[PDB]
Amino acid sequence: SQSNRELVVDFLSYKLSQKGYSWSQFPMAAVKQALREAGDEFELRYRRAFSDLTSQLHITPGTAYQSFEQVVNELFRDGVNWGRIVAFFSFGGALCVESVDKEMQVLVSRIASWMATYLNDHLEPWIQENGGWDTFVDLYG
């Protein structure tokens, strides 16, 4: 999916802009907008910015995808649902904000690639079974 990479990049650039950071580190319009809104709703409800999960990751330029996948898997203990997909985007955005805070902005494009990998491998199977991104738009748009 080229569409999935674009969605990840849009959500991450959105979150970086919104929070005061640079995003220069790297129908589709309705999915992008619905997701932006969903992440904002998610983040007002759950304020801790995945602090324990980012700590569990302990991301560095040495970190490989397998380590990211294992931590992200934690969001899906009880399988996929729509809020947990939003949680996933929100977590990657948190990781990216952490990385820019740390002067580790080299991580941001890597995190984006990893999120696209994970979404394609692990999340799209459920998404497609439950009505695809059109159903996401009905729900959140």
From Swiss-Prot:
It is found in: Mitochondrion membrane; Nucleus membrane; Cytoplasm, Cytoskeleton, Microtubule organizing center, Centrosome. Its main location: mitochondrion. A motif (BH3) lies at residues 31-45. Keywords: Apoptosis, Cytoplasm, Cytoplasmic vesicle, Cytoskeleton, Membrane, Mitochondrion, Mitochondrion inner membrane, Mitochondrion outer membrane, Nucleus, Phosphoprotein, Synapse, Transmembrane, Transmembrane helix, Ubl conjugation. Widely expressed, with highest levels in the brain, thymus, bone marrow, and kidney. Bcl-X(L) and Bcl-X(delta-TM) expression is enhanced in B- and T-lymphocytes that have been activated. GO terms for molecular function: BH3 domain binding; identical protein binding; protein kinase binding. A motif (BH1) lies at residues 74-93. GO terms for biological process: apoptotic process; apoptotic process in bone marrow cell; cellular response to alkaloid; cellular response to amino acid stimulus; cellular response to gamma radiation; defense response to virus; dendritic cell apoptotic process; dendritic cell proliferation. A motif (BH4) lies at residues 3-23. Potent inhibitor of cell death. Inhibits activation of caspases. Appears to regulate cell death by blocking the voltage-dependent anion channel (VDAC) by binding to it and preventing the release of the caspase activator, CYC1, from the mitochondrial membrane. Also acts as a regulator of G2 checkpoint and progression to cytokinesis during mitosis. Belongs to the Bcl-2 family. Homodimer. Interacts with BAD. Interacts with PGAM5. Interacts with HEBP2. Interacts with p53/TP53 and BBC3; interaction with BBC3 disrupts the interaction with p53/TP53. Interacts with ATP5F1A and ATP5F1B; the interactions mediate the association of isoform Bcl-X(L) with the mitochondrial membrane ATP synthase F(1)F(0) ATP synthase. Interacts with VDAC1. Interacts with BCL2L11 (via BH3). Interacts with RNF183. Interacts with GIMAP3/IAN4 and GIMAP5/IAN5. Interacts with GIMAP5 and HSPA8/HSC70; the interaction between HSPA8 and BCL2L1 is impaired in the absence of GIMAP5. The BH4 motif is required for anti-apoptotic activity. The BH1 and BH2 motifs are required for both heterodimerization with other Bcl-2 family members and for repression of cell death. This is Bcl-2-like protein 1. The gene is Bcl2l1.
